[PDB]
Amino acid sequence: SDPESLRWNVQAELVHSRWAMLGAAGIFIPEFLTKLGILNTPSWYTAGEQEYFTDTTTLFIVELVFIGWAEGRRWADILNPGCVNTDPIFPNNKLTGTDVGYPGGLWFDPLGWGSASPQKLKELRTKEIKNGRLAMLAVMGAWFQHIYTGTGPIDNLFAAHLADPHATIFAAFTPK
């Protein structure tokens, strides 16, 4: 008859989805773009030629210092200031709420018409393919399985085996 489920912060999950899959937009075409044999072959002897490696897990700091700065300072001030204490405007804070941010403060505001509104027209682009990313990297992020799993010979683990026709990997297409 139906679940009392809609989170109220059901509003948050979705701008958490603009995260996961717009971000995963920068994966589908850089990966499956490849360039097969551009001319041919990658040769990467450069910042990794001969200086005792380069990254790996000093990669993580240099990667996620300013991604720490990027992601960190994102949802914190997407909009919300005011931020204090006592009573509810319902999500699980909304202490900004009725207050935009500052009474008579500065230029807290982006743009005219007493709001944060970047006008009403732009439902066209970011509704379809951009949240399509959600429903695309859903099964095309679940091509993950098909692309590698089956562990190209080398490794069978707790040998049950249980079947044998032929291998499985990735390249595009398929037998049949």
């Binding site: 044999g37 072959t41 990658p42 040769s43 990467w44 002897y45």
Partner: peptide, 29 residues
């Protein structure tokens, strides 16, 4: 990894391969 020549000299090859008589199956029978 680390590469020296040339992802190959002669590219990937005889690992699917069938070609002149792609036969087995369509054929056998």
């Amino acid at each position: 990894g680390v590469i020296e020549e040339y992802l190959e000299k002669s590219k990937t090859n005889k690992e699917l391969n069938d070609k002149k008589r792609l036969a087995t199956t369509g054929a056998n029978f």
